[PDB]
Amino acid sequence: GAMEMNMADAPLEEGLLVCTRLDQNLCAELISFGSGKATVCLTPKEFMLCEDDVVHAGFIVGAASFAALCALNKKNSLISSMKVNLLAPIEIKQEIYFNATITHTSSKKSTIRVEGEFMEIKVFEGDFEILVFRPFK
């Protein structure tokens, strides 16, 4: 498909298959995706703070998580696990770019590496495992 994807002015999200219900205002702005990668950008808001000068880990990891899902961009996918390092505390007004790249893939699962950068300095790094298929036992 699809005519809507062609079009000078097609929204970037048009071809995005994952997290259809996600409000980017609560997570991160999608910047690009495709070819086994994605970038999102988090500009933290006051509601995201844990402390006056520390953005809550849920929002830092939440942005990384979204980048990771966008790199694979598959309909029926879930994050199953992650190992992540929050290298420095982030304040509001800091723009953090999260760049995801798939490192391993199969029909059933992938591993995606995410690096977060502030002014091109790494401040986050993580590996996410994603499962692609919901039934459970």
Add this chain to the structure above:
Amino acid sequence: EEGLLVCTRLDQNLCAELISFGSGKATVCLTPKEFMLCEDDVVHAGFIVGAASFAALCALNKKNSLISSMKVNLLAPIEIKQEIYFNATITHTSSKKSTIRVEGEFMEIKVFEGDFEILVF
């Protein structure tokens, strides 16, 4: 939240309700809202990790603390208004650095587990 030394600025409606804390343990309860969804039947990982993170910080309960790393397994997708209790317990501490284990359960079925490393300055 008297005696609570961590996350003074955190909006509990956007995260999880603090149920109890003290003695190197804490429980919080996540009530998923629609704004938290990634997909119709999957709460975004950021809110699940956010809830666990809050639990972990309240277990240690130290001023000037920061989550420096985590290893977590999301064991099942979480859906709207499944109440999820996250129970955090310190497993290692040298004051400067601590490890907190957090388990989240829906009913008594385990939907989340992880280890959180916390630095205090």
